[PDB]
Amino acid sequence: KVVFVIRLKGVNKLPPKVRSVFRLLRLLQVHNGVFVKVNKATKEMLKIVEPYVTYGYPTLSTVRKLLYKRGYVRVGKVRRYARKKIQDNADISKHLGKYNVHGIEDMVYQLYTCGPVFKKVNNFLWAFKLKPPRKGFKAKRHAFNEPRPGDWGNREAHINELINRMI
Amino acid sequence: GIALKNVGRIKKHGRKHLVSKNPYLRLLVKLYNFLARRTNANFNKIIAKRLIMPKRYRPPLSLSKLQYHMANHPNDIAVVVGSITDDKRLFSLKQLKVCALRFTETARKRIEDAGGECLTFDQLALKYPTGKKCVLLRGPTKARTAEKHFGKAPGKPKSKARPYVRSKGRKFEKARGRRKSRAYKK
Amino acid sequence: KHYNVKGKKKVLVPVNAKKTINKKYFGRKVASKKKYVVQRKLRKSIEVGKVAIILTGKHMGKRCIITKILNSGLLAVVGPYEINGVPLKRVDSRYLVVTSTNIFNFENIAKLKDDFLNYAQDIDDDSFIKTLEIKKKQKKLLKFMNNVIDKIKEIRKEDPKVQKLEGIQKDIGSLLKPEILKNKVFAHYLKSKFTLRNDMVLHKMKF
Amino acid sequence: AVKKVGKIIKKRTKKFTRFQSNRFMRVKPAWRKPRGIDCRVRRRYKGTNLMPSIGYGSNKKTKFLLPNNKYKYVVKNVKEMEPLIMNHTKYCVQIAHNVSSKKRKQIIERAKQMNVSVINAKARL
RNA sequence: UCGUUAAGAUGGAACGGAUUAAGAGAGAAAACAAGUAAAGAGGGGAAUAUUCUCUUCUUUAUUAAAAGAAACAUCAGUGAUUAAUUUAAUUUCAAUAAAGCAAUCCCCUGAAAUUGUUUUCACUUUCUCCCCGCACUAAUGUGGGGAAAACUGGCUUUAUUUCUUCAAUUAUUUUUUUUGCUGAGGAAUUUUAAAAUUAUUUGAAUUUUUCUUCUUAUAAUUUAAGUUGUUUCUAUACAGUACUUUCUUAACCCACUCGUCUUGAAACACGGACCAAGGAGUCUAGCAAAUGUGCAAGUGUAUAUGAUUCUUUAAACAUUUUACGCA
RNA sequence: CCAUUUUUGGUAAGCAGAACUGGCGAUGAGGGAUGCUCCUAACGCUUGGAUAAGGUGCCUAAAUAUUCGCUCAUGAGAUCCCAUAAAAGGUGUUGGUUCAUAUGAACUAGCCCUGAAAAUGGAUGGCGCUAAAGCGGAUUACCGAUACCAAGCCAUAAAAAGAAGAAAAAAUUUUUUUUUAGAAUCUUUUUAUGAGUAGAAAAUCGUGGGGUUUGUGUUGAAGCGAAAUACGUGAGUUUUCGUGGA
RNA sequence: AGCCAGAAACCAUGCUGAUUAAACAAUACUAUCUUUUUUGUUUGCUAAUGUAAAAGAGAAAUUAUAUAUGUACCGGUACAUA
């Protein structure tokens, strides 16, 4: 139902359709990760950017842990966002109060299960800008279904291992 | 390196401050900025913006237009973010209570004579700080002399505008390109 | 007193008052953080009966035996004065390399532990303090050269707190010396300084 | 490197020297950026010669401050002391170069009576 | 540009940046010492030009202190390390000592006989024995032919797990050993509130508890609510070889003639021996938009007249005791 | 003007001409020995972290690492753009595969070899390297950018937000000492952002004169030379010592 | 694998230079002067200071290294030892 998609390619020299998809995807910084709801249009968008992003299924412990350490939320106004670290429920109880998914565990729940309000919560959340990925990365070129090393493209469950390294 | 358009900047356009050096107008924008910020009233916010706006682009209002607009209003308090000019083309009997940026001396005298009120912006702020039960008005732009001059080419076909022309003389701009007989017309 | 979050049971000491920092407009104030400070929490190997190598001291490389963990969280140590010449000194934890050997597992020594404990219990950190008046008294000598050094040493010796400490030093040494001295190899090991020049892989806690 | 002193960080040692002034006698020593021209050193070819920009600027709290912890105020007449005196804690006196000795002595003495440091009082004897 | 002296340097360039060093110079205003007593110099205020008294500089000695740098401890933020740990999941095991079952047979794995299973015989060991070769070996053996067994191994059991074991990989978790770096800030109606934790108090709960949970009341504290503390030192200085900082070579790393037109200049493209001074988007006219400013259906006093205008006054002032431009 | 892919002319061309996109130009840091365009990656000022491309015998920072192959060359071979080598052979060695009767054929493709000549001396960047430091894999560790993460600081942008009161320390409950903000293009606060030629803008700084203001002058000004624990991101400002005489 | 002979080619030999090695040895005679100890080295000069490395700066086979070394016998044999 959900997929965590991590960009892993620079901003120089981008194809134009890929550039457009990146704007919609919201991976404007080269080490952004973001959650995406799997449907058919989203999968085709992911396909267009495929050699330049790694992606996979984010397990429930990982999703919480990443959200705990790197959770920021947009606390400003629509198209006048302000980026604040999430250290209490009151900020997000303001923003998500109408939707009733106020407080961080409910957001975590929506992320876990692909809940009834996914888009708005995702949209309120900042796109997670991640650390370089510790020991055992390597091979920026091509993609993971080449037998040779290189995490790029689909890596399913193994996304979590990569996320754990770059947390 | 982030991919943001306009390098992520929000770039506001139009007036960023009032650029007048007039002490009274500087005092007035201080006042209306305070009144807008504290009240959070839309009426005050419009007044502040219109006070900041270019003095040239601030309009005259005709007295005939002011009366014509105020006709369905039994509350008498007109506010005008521009200058109120007099009328010499009709009887102009019915009085009003009008706050304006500037009054012509003849207009002011007529309004006062008729039993009206010519009201300062400080008096308006003091009496009516919320703007309730009042009428905000604007004079018209109505194609001023520059507007008549400009607007996507006068010499292009299917366009109505004034070029440079010095056409007080006789033998002025009427032929080739402006004439169906001589080559073609706009 | 203590705070016990996540089972950690810290153990808290009341700390001395803070120095004051300027407020944004009017005056200055104390900061409020940690009016109770967590205890020292020394290396888990360390124990009173163990003999340790003095790392940075004047007589550094000597093997000297631990006395009291002080209320300052520093420790007192003595490498028996009468036999080895090392005083009853104050020392801090990271500046002392504690060896695995323990004194009170030698048969003679273990019967005199209570006497050692009572002498140890009496001493504390405030006994060792330099004192502004005495510090000034040595300093005021500046205005032949060997004489002034001798006078400063004379002035330190004269001090009653120093004298009281030297009394305890003498009493502890007197208590321990005969029994230590009969155990000749151990006495020699106490007298002997640290060994390492190139001999083996440095700093093992097998020692 | 840089020069920390208390809460006062000054971020620039070694004031910049104008490019090519080492080679040519004619070119003034005091810094100028080659902003008016193409020049292949504004093009940031590494190690050729470092050049300044806004980022090195002083912090907002310390902005013009002296290591005295006091802003410099230049004094050429005695009466100019009188508004300055209630802020003597935060400001330090500089006496102007062009002050005649009788007047200078009077200003120095008065300033000392007013209880504020005067940084060139130990000069022009 | 060149002379004298002094200091340094100097293996086919020269100078530079970044970074420390050692030398040579300079400096005390943040880079220590409030007050008290003794005796010199000033200034004031009050009292009714001189009585009282308040004050600041020099000097002797005589008690404070504060400030920065260290060092360790303690936190919060951030890392790196090396041991771990929970209950699940998924053809894990391995021994332990008592029993059995078959003998190339079994755990296995072979080879065979439309859209099903199943049936056949092939396959272990040996430091066992025999026969031939009779020492023929890579070998404390050996090549070939046969037999032997279940020590060996396999399975079924029955107990057993600290004799030896109890995997691996996911899943959800919980820690721990050393240790590196960092400390913005300063909360006169939000550094407050709640949370947390401790000692109490009352009611519940449930896996049942020495870090078990909630809420009832009470106090404190910090894990809340951005570093503090202690002890040293500089130093009991008055500028010293220390401290600050300039200059100076060093050494490591980097560094190609600037300007120029040029797609492309380090160029075998061009200008430049060196230094000084002078040296280049202006002024008028007429037009435009912009913005400021004054007035408004008008506006602009044009030419010109007037004056107790007549150092300034070569403009400033006024418009008869209903021209003209543009709209 | 350059590159990939598609592409027309021309024997071909670092030739002429395009298409789509991305670059370079106008822009760089790290790698590609080296290099305008290849790769990684686009840049305020700093500290720490972890990586990328790329490497890890020495030059030269990290492994004389692990693991399985292959390879001896009387001119071995060594990484895209990148700076040559083919048809054709080989009873050199290595794998296969088809066939025939533990042996004879035939093929096949890996390496290696012949085929393989040129102008100052000469070039895997150099030394060297063959139980590789070669060539083909795989397994880990480490080093490795100004990018990335965390923190500080600077400016810009945007957003919040505003038109009145006691804190501490020294003394010996009462005396003393430090501080005690309201400038609306100003002040407090937050978050985001930072390439740049041609070119446009804004904020400054300096020079000559004038009106205006309130100062400096012979107990020595301007000027000048040497400087300054000096100030400012900077242009510059200020000052000290020496000269100097309005 | 192991070898051999074999060219006007190649390196020596020969021969030239060798402040091309910022190179060096031996011999002859010589400069208030040489040697040991102590204190110091915190107008151009006339007492005078330098270390790219101290800190236990400790360390005698030998061909090999798909086998060696002793010792006794006669490069060989035997016996030991690593």
Side-chain angles (χ1 to χ4, degrees), chain B residues 15 20 54-55 57 86 88 102 104-106 144 168:
Chain B
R15 300 276 260 213
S20 176
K55 182 81 154 286
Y57 282 30
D86 202 1
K88 312 299 150 74
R102 197 188 171 299
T104 73
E105 184 183 69
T106 181
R144 73 173 166 98
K168 65 172 180 176

Short mmCIF file of all heavy atoms in Angstrom, two decimals, chain B residues 15 20 54-55 57 86 88 102 104-106 144 168, chain E residues 288-298 326:
data_model
loop_
_atom_site.label_atom_id
_atom_site.label_comp_id
_atom_site.label_asym_id
_atom_site.label_seq_id
_atom_site.Cartn_x
_atom_site.Cartn_y
_atom_site.Cartn_z
N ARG B 15 4.35 48.07 -4.32
CA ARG B 15 4.92 48.87 -3.25
C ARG B 15 5.29 48.09 -1.98
O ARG B 15 4.50 47.32 -1.43
CB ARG B 15 3.94 50.00 -2.82
CG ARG B 15 3.57 50.99 -3.94
CD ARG B 15 4.56 52.14 -4.16
NE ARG B 15 4.01 53.36 -3.47
CZ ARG B 15 4.18 54.61 -3.91
NH1 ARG B 15 4.97 54.92 -4.93
NH2 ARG B 15 3.51 55.59 -3.31
N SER B 20 6.80 58.30 -0.16
CA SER B 20 6.61 59.72 0.12
C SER B 20 7.39 60.19 1.34
O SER B 20 7.59 59.47 2.32
CB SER B 20 5.11 60.09 0.33
OG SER B 20 4.91 61.46 0.70
N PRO B 54 0.84 54.42 -5.25
CA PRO B 54 1.31 55.63 -5.92
C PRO B 54 0.32 56.75 -6.03
O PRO B 54 -0.79 56.54 -6.51
CB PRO B 54 1.77 55.16 -7.30
CG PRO B 54 2.22 53.73 -7.05
CD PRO B 54 1.22 53.23 -6.02
N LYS B 55 0.71 57.97 -5.62
CA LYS B 55 -0.07 59.19 -5.59
C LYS B 55 -0.71 59.52 -6.93
O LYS B 55 -1.87 59.91 -7.01
CB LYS B 55 0.87 60.34 -5.18
CG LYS B 55 0.27 61.75 -5.02
CD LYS B 55 -0.43 61.99 -3.67
CE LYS B 55 -0.47 63.47 -3.24
NZ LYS B 55 0.87 63.92 -2.80
N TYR B 57 -1.43 57.23 -9.29
CA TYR B 57 -2.39 56.19 -9.58
C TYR B 57 -3.58 56.25 -8.63
O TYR B 57 -4.65 55.71 -8.92
CB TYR B 57 -1.75 54.77 -9.55
CG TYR B 57 -0.94 54.40 -10.78
CD1 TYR B 57 -0.23 55.32 -11.59
CD2 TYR B 57 -0.86 53.03 -11.12
CE1 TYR B 57 0.53 54.89 -12.68
CE2 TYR B 57 -0.10 52.60 -12.22
CZ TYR B 57 0.60 53.53 -13.00
OH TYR B 57 1.35 53.09 -14.11
N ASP B 86 -14.89 68.66 -7.83
CA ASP B 86 -16.21 69.24 -7.93
C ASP B 86 -16.83 68.99 -9.30
O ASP B 86 -16.19 68.53 -10.25
CB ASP B 86 -16.13 70.74 -7.60
CG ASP B 86 -17.44 71.38 -7.15
OD1 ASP B 86 -18.48 70.68 -7.06
OD2 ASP B 86 -17.42 72.61 -6.91
N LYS B 88 -19.36 70.80 -12.35
CA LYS B 88 -19.93 72.00 -12.93
C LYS B 88 -20.99 71.62 -13.96
O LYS B 88 -21.36 72.43 -14.81
CB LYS B 88 -18.81 72.87 -13.57
CG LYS B 88 -17.57 73.10 -12.68
CD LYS B 88 -17.84 73.84 -11.35
CE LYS B 88 -16.88 73.45 -10.21
NZ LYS B 88 -15.53 74.03 -10.36
N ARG B 102 -7.94 64.15 -0.32
CA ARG B 102 -7.80 65.54 -0.65
C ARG B 102 -9.12 66.11 -1.18
O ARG B 102 -9.84 65.44 -1.91
CB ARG B 102 -6.67 65.70 -1.69
CG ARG B 102 -6.15 67.13 -1.83
CD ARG B 102 -5.17 67.31 -3.01
NE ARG B 102 -4.92 68.77 -3.17
CZ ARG B 102 -5.89 69.64 -3.45
NH1 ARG B 102 -7.03 69.32 -4.07
NH2 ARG B 102 -5.73 70.93 -3.20
N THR B 104 -10.84 69.39 -3.38
CA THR B 104 -10.79 70.69 -4.06
C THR B 104 -11.55 71.74 -3.28
O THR B 104 -12.54 71.45 -2.61
CB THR B 104 -11.15 70.72 -5.55
OG1 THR B 104 -12.52 70.55 -5.85
CG2 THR B 104 -10.38 69.58 -6.23
N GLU B 105 -11.08 73.00 -3.29
CA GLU B 105 -11.62 74.02 -2.40
C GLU B 105 -13.09 74.32 -2.66
O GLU B 105 -13.92 74.38 -1.76
CB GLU B 105 -10.81 75.32 -2.57
CG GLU B 105 -11.22 76.46 -1.61
CD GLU B 105 -10.44 77.73 -1.90
OE1 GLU B 105 -10.66 78.35 -2.98
OE2 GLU B 105 -9.61 78.13 -1.05
N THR B 106 -13.43 74.43 -3.95
CA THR B 106 -14.79 74.53 -4.45
C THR B 106 -15.68 73.36 -4.05
O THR B 106 -16.81 73.56 -3.59
CB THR B 106 -14.81 74.77 -5.96
OG1 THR B 106 -16.11 74.89 -6.52
CG2 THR B 106 -14.03 73.69 -6.73
N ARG B 144 -6.66 56.79 -18.09
CA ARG B 144 -5.85 57.99 -18.06
C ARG B 144 -4.94 58.18 -19.28
O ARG B 144 -4.79 57.30 -20.12
CB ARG B 144 -5.06 58.20 -16.74
CG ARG B 144 -3.86 57.27 -16.52
CD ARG B 144 -3.01 57.64 -15.29
NE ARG B 144 -2.13 56.45 -15.06
CZ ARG B 144 -0.86 56.35 -15.47
NH1 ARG B 144 -0.06 57.39 -15.60
NH2 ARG B 144 -0.38 55.14 -15.74
N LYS B 168 -2.84 68.14 -34.20
CA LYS B 168 -3.47 69.45 -34.27
C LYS B 168 -3.42 70.05 -35.68
O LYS B 168 -4.36 70.71 -36.13
CB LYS B 168 -2.91 70.45 -33.22
CG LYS B 168 -1.44 70.86 -33.37
CD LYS B 168 -1.08 71.99 -32.39
CE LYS B 168 0.38 72.45 -32.48
NZ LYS B 168 0.61 73.60 -31.59
P A E 288 5.50 63.84 -24.52
OP1 A E 288 4.03 63.82 -24.77
OP2 A E 288 5.97 64.83 -23.51
"O5'" A E 288 5.95 62.39 -24.04
"C5'" A E 288 5.75 61.20 -24.82
"C4'" A E 288 6.37 59.96 -24.16
"O4'" A E 288 7.82 60.12 -24.14
"C3'" A E 288 6.03 59.75 -22.68
"O3'" A E 288 4.74 59.10 -22.60
"C2'" A E 288 7.20 58.88 -22.23
"O2'" A E 288 7.05 57.52 -22.56
"C1'" A E 288 8.35 59.49 -22.99
N9 A E 288 9.12 60.41 -22.17
C8 A E 288 9.13 61.77 -22.26
N7 A E 288 9.98 62.34 -21.43
C5 A E 288 10.56 61.27 -20.76
C6 A E 288 11.60 61.20 -19.81
N6 A E 288 12.35 62.26 -19.47
N1 A E 288 11.90 59.99 -19.28
C2 A E 288 11.23 58.92 -19.73
N3 A E 288 10.30 58.86 -20.69
C4 A E 288 10.02 60.08 -21.18
P A E 289 3.75 59.43 -21.41
OP1 A E 289 2.36 59.23 -21.93
OP2 A E 289 4.05 60.78 -20.86
"O5'" A E 289 4.06 58.35 -20.28
"C5'" A E 289 4.02 56.93 -20.55
"C4'" A E 289 5.04 56.17 -19.68
"O4'" A E 289 6.39 56.62 -20.01
"C3'" A E 289 4.95 56.34 -18.16
"O3'" A E 289 3.96 55.44 -17.57
"C2'" A E 289 6.37 55.99 -17.75
"O2'" A E 289 6.54 54.59 -17.73
"C1'" A E 289 7.18 56.61 -18.84
N9 A E 289 7.61 57.96 -18.49
C8 A E 289 6.99 59.12 -18.86
N7 A E 289 7.61 60.19 -18.47
C5 A E 289 8.66 59.69 -17.72
C6 A E 289 9.67 60.32 -16.99
N6 A E 289 9.82 61.66 -17.02
N1 A E 289 10.51 59.54 -16.28
C2 A E 289 10.38 58.21 -16.36
N3 A E 289 9.49 57.50 -17.05
C4 A E 289 8.65 58.31 -17.71
P A E 290 3.22 55.93 -16.25
OP1 A E 290 2.20 54.90 -15.88
OP2 A E 290 2.66 57.30 -16.40
"O5'" A E 290 4.35 55.89 -15.15
"C5'" A E 290 4.92 54.62 -14.76
"C4'" A E 290 6.18 54.78 -13.90
"O4'" A E 290 7.27 55.41 -14.65
"C3'" A E 290 6.06 55.66 -12.66
"O3'" A E 290 5.37 54.94 -11.62
"C2'" A E 290 7.51 55.97 -12.37
"O2'" A E 290 8.17 54.88 -11.77
"C1'" A E 290 8.01 56.24 -13.77
N9 A E 290 7.84 57.64 -14.10
C8 A E 290 6.84 58.24 -14.83
N7 A E 290 6.98 59.53 -14.93
C5 A E 290 8.12 59.81 -14.19
C6 A E 290 8.81 61.01 -13.91
N6 A E 290 8.40 62.20 -14.34
N1 A E 290 9.93 60.94 -13.16
C2 A E 290 10.32 59.74 -12.71
N3 A E 290 9.74 58.54 -12.90
C4 A E 290 8.65 58.65 -13.67
P U E 291 4.04 55.59 -11.02
OP1 U E 291 3.08 54.50 -10.69
OP2 U E 291 3.53 56.69 -11.89
"O5'" U E 291 4.55 56.26 -9.67
"C5'" U E 291 5.51 55.59 -8.82
"C4'" U E 291 6.54 56.56 -8.26
"O4'" U E 291 7.47 57.04 -9.28
"C3'" U E 291 5.97 57.83 -7.64
"O3'" U E 291 5.34 57.52 -6.37
"C2'" U E 291 7.19 58.73 -7.63
"O2'" U E 291 8.05 58.48 -6.54
"C1'" U E 291 7.82 58.38 -8.98
N1 U E 291 7.38 59.32 -10.03
C2 U E 291 7.96 60.55 -10.05
O2 U E 291 8.84 60.89 -9.25
N3 U E 291 7.48 61.40 -10.99
C4 U E 291 6.37 61.23 -11.78
O4 U E 291 5.97 62.16 -12.49
C5 U E 291 5.78 59.93 -11.69
C6 U E 291 6.29 59.04 -10.83
P G E 292 4.13 58.45 -5.96
OP1 G E 292 3.49 57.83 -4.77
OP2 G E 292 3.23 58.70 -7.12
"O5'" G E 292 4.87 59.80 -5.54
"C5'" G E 292 5.76 59.74 -4.40
"C4'" G E 292 6.69 60.96 -4.29
"O4'" G E 292 7.51 61.11 -5.50
"C3'" G E 292 6.03 62.33 -4.15
"O3'" G E 292 5.61 62.54 -2.78
"C2'" G E 292 7.13 63.26 -4.59
"O2'" G E 292 8.11 63.40 -3.57
"C1'" G E 292 7.66 62.51 -5.78
N9 G E 292 6.93 62.91 -6.99
C8 G E 292 5.97 62.19 -7.66
N7 G E 292 5.47 62.82 -8.69
C5 G E 292 6.11 64.05 -8.68
C6 G E 292 5.94 65.19 -9.53
O6 G E 292 5.23 65.30 -10.53
N1 G E 292 6.69 66.27 -9.10
C2 G E 292 7.53 66.26 -8.02
N2 G E 292 8.16 67.40 -7.80
N3 G E 292 7.74 65.19 -7.25
C4 G E 292 6.99 64.14 -7.62
P U E 293 4.11 62.98 -2.58
OP1 U E 293 3.73 62.83 -1.16
OP2 U E 293 3.19 62.36 -3.56
"O5'" U E 293 4.14 64.50 -2.94
"C5'" U E 293 5.09 65.38 -2.31
"C4'" U E 293 5.18 66.69 -3.08
"O4'" U E 293 5.74 66.50 -4.41
"C3'" U E 293 3.82 67.34 -3.33
"O3'" U E 293 3.33 67.94 -2.11
"C2'" U E 293 4.20 68.31 -4.43
"O2'" U E 293 4.88 69.43 -3.91
"C1'" U E 293 5.11 67.43 -5.29
N1 U E 293 4.37 66.75 -6.37
C2 U E 293 4.04 67.50 -7.47
O2 U E 293 4.36 68.68 -7.58
N3 U E 293 3.36 66.84 -8.44
C4 U E 293 2.90 65.55 -8.41
O4 U E 293 2.30 65.09 -9.39
C5 U E 293 3.22 64.84 -7.21
C6 U E 293 3.93 65.45 -6.25
P G E 294 1.76 67.87 -1.89
OP1 G E 294 1.56 68.17 -0.44
OP2 G E 294 1.22 66.58 -2.39
"O5'" G E 294 1.18 69.08 -2.76
"C5'" G E 294 1.73 70.41 -2.55
"C4'" G E 294 1.27 71.45 -3.59
"O4'" G E 294 2.03 71.29 -4.82
"C3'" G E 294 -0.20 71.48 -4.05
"O3'" G E 294 -1.00 72.13 -3.05
"C2'" G E 294 -0.09 72.22 -5.37
"O2'" G E 294 0.00 73.62 -5.19
"C1'" G E 294 1.19 71.64 -5.92
N9 G E 294 0.93 70.48 -6.75
C8 G E 294 0.99 69.16 -6.35
N7 G E 294 0.73 68.33 -7.33
C5 G E 294 0.49 69.15 -8.42
C6 G E 294 0.15 68.81 -9.76
O6 G E 294 0.04 67.68 -10.24
N1 G E 294 -0.08 69.94 -10.53
C2 G E 294 0.01 71.23 -10.09
N2 G E 294 -0.30 72.14 -11.00
N3 G E 294 0.39 71.56 -8.85
C4 G E 294 0.59 70.48 -8.08
P C E 295 -2.47 71.69 -2.75
OP1 C E 295 -2.96 72.44 -1.57
OP2 C E 295 -2.59 70.21 -2.67
"O5'" C E 295 -3.36 72.10 -3.99
"C5'" C E 295 -3.75 73.47 -4.25
"C4'" C E 295 -4.11 73.71 -5.73
"O4'" C E 295 -3.01 73.28 -6.59
"C3'" C E 295 -5.36 73.05 -6.36
"O3'" C E 295 -6.57 73.78 -6.01
"C2'" C E 295 -5.02 73.04 -7.84
"O2'" C E 295 -5.26 74.31 -8.42
"C1'" C E 295 -3.53 72.73 -7.80
N1 C E 295 -3.25 71.27 -7.97
C2 C E 295 -3.46 70.65 -9.20
O2 C E 295 -3.86 71.31 -10.17
N3 C E 295 -3.19 69.33 -9.34
C4 C E 295 -2.76 68.62 -8.29
N4 C E 295 -2.51 67.33 -8.46
C5 C E 295 -2.59 69.22 -7.01
C6 C E 295 -2.85 70.52 -6.89
P A E 296 -7.91 73.05 -5.57
OP1 A E 296 -8.87 74.03 -5.00
OP2 A E 296 -7.60 71.90 -4.68
"O5'" A E 296 -8.51 72.46 -6.90
"C5'" A E 296 -8.92 73.35 -7.96
"C4'" A E 296 -8.95 72.66 -9.32
"O4'" A E 296 -7.71 71.96 -9.58
"C3'" A E 296 -10.03 71.58 -9.54
"O3'" A E 296 -11.35 72.18 -9.66
"C2'" A E 296 -9.47 70.93 -10.80
"O2'" A E 296 -9.74 71.68 -11.97
"C1'" A E 296 -7.96 70.97 -10.55
N9 A E 296 -7.39 69.65 -10.26
C8 A E 296 -7.46 68.63 -11.17
N7 A E 296 -6.91 67.51 -10.78
C5 A E 296 -6.43 67.81 -9.51
C6 A E 296 -5.81 67.01 -8.53
N6 A E 296 -5.52 65.71 -8.71
N1 A E 296 -5.52 67.59 -7.34
C2 A E 296 -5.81 68.88 -7.18
N3 A E 296 -6.40 69.72 -8.01
C4 A E 296 -6.71 69.13 -9.17
P A E 297 -12.64 71.27 -9.63
OP1 A E 297 -13.81 72.17 -9.55
OP2 A E 297 -12.56 70.24 -8.55
"O5'" A E 297 -12.68 70.56 -11.06
"C5'" A E 297 -13.49 71.15 -12.12
"C4'" A E 297 -12.73 72.17 -12.97
"O4'" A E 297 -11.76 71.48 -13.82
"C3'" A E 297 -13.67 72.88 -13.98
"O3'" A E 297 -13.13 74.15 -14.41
"C2'" A E 297 -13.66 71.89 -15.12
"O2'" A E 297 -14.08 72.52 -16.32
"C1'" A E 297 -12.20 71.56 -15.16
N9 A E 297 -11.89 70.34 -15.88
C8 A E 297 -12.63 69.20 -15.86
N7 A E 297 -12.09 68.21 -16.51
C5 A E 297 -10.88 68.73 -16.95
C6 A E 297 -9.81 68.17 -17.69
N6 A E 297 -9.81 66.88 -18.07
N1 A E 297 -8.77 68.99 -17.99
C2 A E 297 -8.79 70.24 -17.55
N3 A E 297 -9.72 70.87 -16.82
C4 A E 297 -10.74 70.04 -16.54
P G E 298 -13.44 75.41 -13.51
OP1 G E 298 -14.60 75.11 -12.61
OP2 G E 298 -13.56 76.62 -14.36
"O5'" G E 298 -12.13 75.48 -12.63
"C5'" G E 298 -10.89 76.03 -13.12
"C4'" G E 298 -9.88 74.90 -13.29
"O4'" G E 298 -10.04 74.35 -14.64
"C3'" G E 298 -8.39 75.28 -13.24
"O3'" G E 298 -7.90 75.36 -11.87
"C2'" G E 298 -7.77 74.15 -14.06
"O2'" G E 298 -7.67 72.94 -13.35
"C1'" G E 298 -8.77 74.01 -15.17
N9 G E 298 -8.40 74.85 -16.32
C8 G E 298 -9.01 76.03 -16.70
N7 G E 298 -8.48 76.55 -17.77
C5 G E 298 -7.47 75.67 -18.12
C6 G E 298 -6.60 75.67 -19.24
O6 G E 298 -6.57 76.51 -20.15
N1 G E 298 -5.73 74.60 -19.21
C2 G E 298 -5.70 73.62 -18.25
N2 G E 298 -4.78 72.70 -18.43
N3 G E 298 -6.54 73.59 -17.21
C4 G E 298 -7.39 74.63 -17.21
P C E 326 -1.38 73.91 -28.14
OP1 C E 326 -0.68 73.29 -29.30
OP2 C E 326 -2.56 74.76 -28.46
"O5'" C E 326 -1.82 72.77 -27.13
"C5'" C E 326 -0.91 71.74 -26.66
"C4'" C E 326 -1.28 71.32 -25.23
"O4'" C E 326 -1.12 72.43 -24.29
"C3'" C E 326 -2.69 70.75 -24.93
"O3'" C E 326 -2.84 69.38 -25.39
"C2'" C E 326 -2.78 70.93 -23.43
"O2'" C E 326 -2.09 69.90 -22.75
"C1'" C E 326 -2.09 72.28 -23.25
N1 C E 326 -3.06 73.40 -23.19
C2 C E 326 -3.70 73.70 -21.98
O2 C E 326 -3.47 73.00 -20.98
N3 C E 326 -4.57 74.72 -21.91
C4 C E 326 -4.81 75.47 -23.00
N4 C E 326 -5.63 76.50 -22.86
C5 C E 326 -4.18 75.20 -24.24
C6 C E 326 -3.33 74.16 -24.30
#
